[PDB]
Amino acid sequence: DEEAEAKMLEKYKQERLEEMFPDEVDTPRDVAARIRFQKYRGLKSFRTSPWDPKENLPQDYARIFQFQNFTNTRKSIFKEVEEKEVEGAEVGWYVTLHVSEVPVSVVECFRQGTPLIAFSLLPHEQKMSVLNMVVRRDPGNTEPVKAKEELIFHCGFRRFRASPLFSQHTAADKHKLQRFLTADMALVATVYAPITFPPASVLLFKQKSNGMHSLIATGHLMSVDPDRMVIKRVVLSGHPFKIFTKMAVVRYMFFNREDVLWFKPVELRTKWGRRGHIKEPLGTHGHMKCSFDGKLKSQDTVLMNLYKRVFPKWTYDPYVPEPVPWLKS
Amino acid sequence: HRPGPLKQQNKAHKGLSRVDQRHRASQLRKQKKEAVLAEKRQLGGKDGPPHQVLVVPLHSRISLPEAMQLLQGTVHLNELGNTQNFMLLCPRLKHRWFFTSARPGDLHVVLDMAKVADTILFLLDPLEGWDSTGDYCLSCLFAQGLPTYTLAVQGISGLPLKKQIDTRKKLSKAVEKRFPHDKLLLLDTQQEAGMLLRQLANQKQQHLAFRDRRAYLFAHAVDFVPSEENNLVGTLKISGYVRGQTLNVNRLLHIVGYGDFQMKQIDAPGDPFPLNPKVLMKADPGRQESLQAEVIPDPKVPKGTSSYQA
């Protein structure tokens, strides 16, 4: 009730903060930056800088399947179903199918009037893998959705509940995490799901409190690969005391000397376009001296980018609750 | 550097007959027309599955039973717990129909019968275009994929004639922001129903790329028999027309709300409603038959000394 509305205000405030400043964070005072951002590393050129696609794969990737050549396998299977004839009942025959392990409740779904549609799949479409689906937010819905909350997927004759992972749609190797799905561009939802060969329409629904489903996102399936790297960015901010000739003393960025000594060998930037790196930590309260390529103004703020490959969450639920009929809000 | 006059710069020295064209055009025309004729004959005829028509009203004021009474040749009415779908036969026009219907708003019914249908008949209000429920259904149908669709208006006869023409203009204006070049029809009398049925029979078919590659089936009749009643599982017998491709037992069968399943037998009984008024040939074993393994089966310091003096 009121806690739900308080969480709605909290999520809207988080959306506004992410929209204003992209993914800045406040550094923890008590928790050391070495142990908080332990798995975060800094990239030099983001896209160009080499990230190994096999470093630190989790246990969930030990349960899924991989294509060594997805394009050629899909083309071969489509060529085979197009040209090569498989023996069986062909198009137009009124057939009956005895299928072995079926729960009783499906019959009670038919008897009260719900339609029942079966489809014979392609090979290798029952196994679980990682699906990347390009989506756009429906203009009819405006409530925020966070990056790892559960949604309902209508993907290619299949309906399932799962937790996606939102990333930017680029043609590079590293794709930045989108912490919130905004209503202007095309994003990619990455999730553990059974293999589906493209093309396939993709619908993202959110279950309301009264049993209604609101249409969140509309799009199509893009690929089936766990080789895609989704990267979460953490931006740290620092304020200079005073400016010398291409030398600045940054405060409010770290709060220990060992934290500055930890995040030393990766470069930093500024909001106004300057670029520099940490020269040496000055105080043992986190204060540091760092050199730049040009003398920056006192109102300039320095930024630091930390990157970590984030994997999606195994929340694959094949059961979707039956809706109530949709109506006015 | 540009050299001056003192450096030497030598000036350079500026040193098919019309019968054959018509025959080629006619050859291409015959090939295209033969391919078109084969594709048009492949649907809804004597050799094909029935033309499936999903009748979706887009307003709360649309009297769906009246429209489905107008739409029903020979009518064979399959009934369910609440809804009814009917097979229609026109041996005059030589065409077979299966009319199903669904109110907008209940998401799974409309989407599951829209992913299998061949034509969608959108019913329209004479005054307004559609409800917000109809707009939600239209957004879902556009996102999922539209097959061949036809728009029909139900209530143009109740109005006075001046208002009839003016409201037809206003309705086309309202609808044109979503269906920009589509002709509305009218559903008032039996002859308008006949013209609508003829329009549905002869119409170019939008092809959905997903269901064309995999086999699929809409259940006409389903029965059950339990292997163990306490286990609440057993052999399900589903009967309907094959639509997309040729199905085989060596690949699985997915039911849209209940996941993957393994067929054990496929038989071909008699067609219950043929247009012009037991046998099984398949082998089961797992030499190439896929299994439901979605997951991989493989698993000197003093007491007073501080760190500086240390």
């Binding site: 800094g42 794969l57 399947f65 290798h124 930890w262 | 991989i296």
Partner: peptide, 23 residues
């Protein structure tokens, strides 16, 4: 004595293979 770049040298890339479907 570790920093951000040295600890990345201690990351093995041969443990959690997904099963590969060949061609």
């Amino acid at each position: 004595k570790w920093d951000c770049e040295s600890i990345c040298s201690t990351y093995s890339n041969l443990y959690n293979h997904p099963q590969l479907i060949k061609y």
